[PDB]
Amino acid sequence: KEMATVTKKVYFDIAIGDKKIGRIEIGLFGNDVPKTVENFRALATGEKGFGYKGSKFHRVIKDFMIQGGDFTRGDGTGGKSIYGDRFEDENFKLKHYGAGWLSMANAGKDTNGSQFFITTVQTTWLDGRHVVFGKVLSGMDVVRKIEQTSTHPGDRPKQSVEIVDCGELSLDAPFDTPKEAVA
């Protein structure tokens, strides 16, 4: 009701330019959005032969969100799911409760691919249009360091913000986390 169950964990290791920034650890709500979660998890491991490793955060807007996941074109026009190019909006059970929530970028209804964003504020106006599926468990300082990186007009970072490494972590047991902002 006020908690959601993390069932999987993934990590993104971030560099900005040549500087090693650190890790974003992400909990995934596999009992609520299993299809969306499986897509994100598999793209993080690269186990289908393509995925997030080496891709960039291409759209960064202060006091809004940071967006990445376009591993095929790198400019917001690309990316793909593990299911085929696009899949339907699974459900909208989870909301953008505050900073630190993971949600699918899309190109309209039922167009989920691989692009995703991490909120840095409570983006209530995105509720019901973007499928929320995860929450930052650690490394919110890394998220905010990305969020504050200097951008060109059109919100592309001037320095390359790269997911240098990424994958899945072992989770001993699912656990509940509050439906609230990540501090």
From TrEMBL:
Q: Name the reaction it catalyses.
A: [protein]-peptidylproline (omega=180) = [protein]-peptidylproline (omega=0)
Name the domain of life this protein comes from. Eukaryota
Q: Name one GO cellular component term.
A: cytoplasm
- What Gene3D superfamilies does the entry give? Cyclophilin-like (2.40.100.10)
What biological function has been recorded for the protein in this entry?
PPIases accelerate the folding of proteins. It catalyzes the cis-trans isomerization of proline imidic peptide bonds in oligopeptides.
Family membership noted in the UniProt record: Belongs to the cyclophilin-type PPIase family.
Q: What is this protein called?
A: Peptidyl-prolyl cis-trans isomerase
Q: Which organism is it from?
A: Brugia malayi
Q: Which gene encodes it?
A: SM7
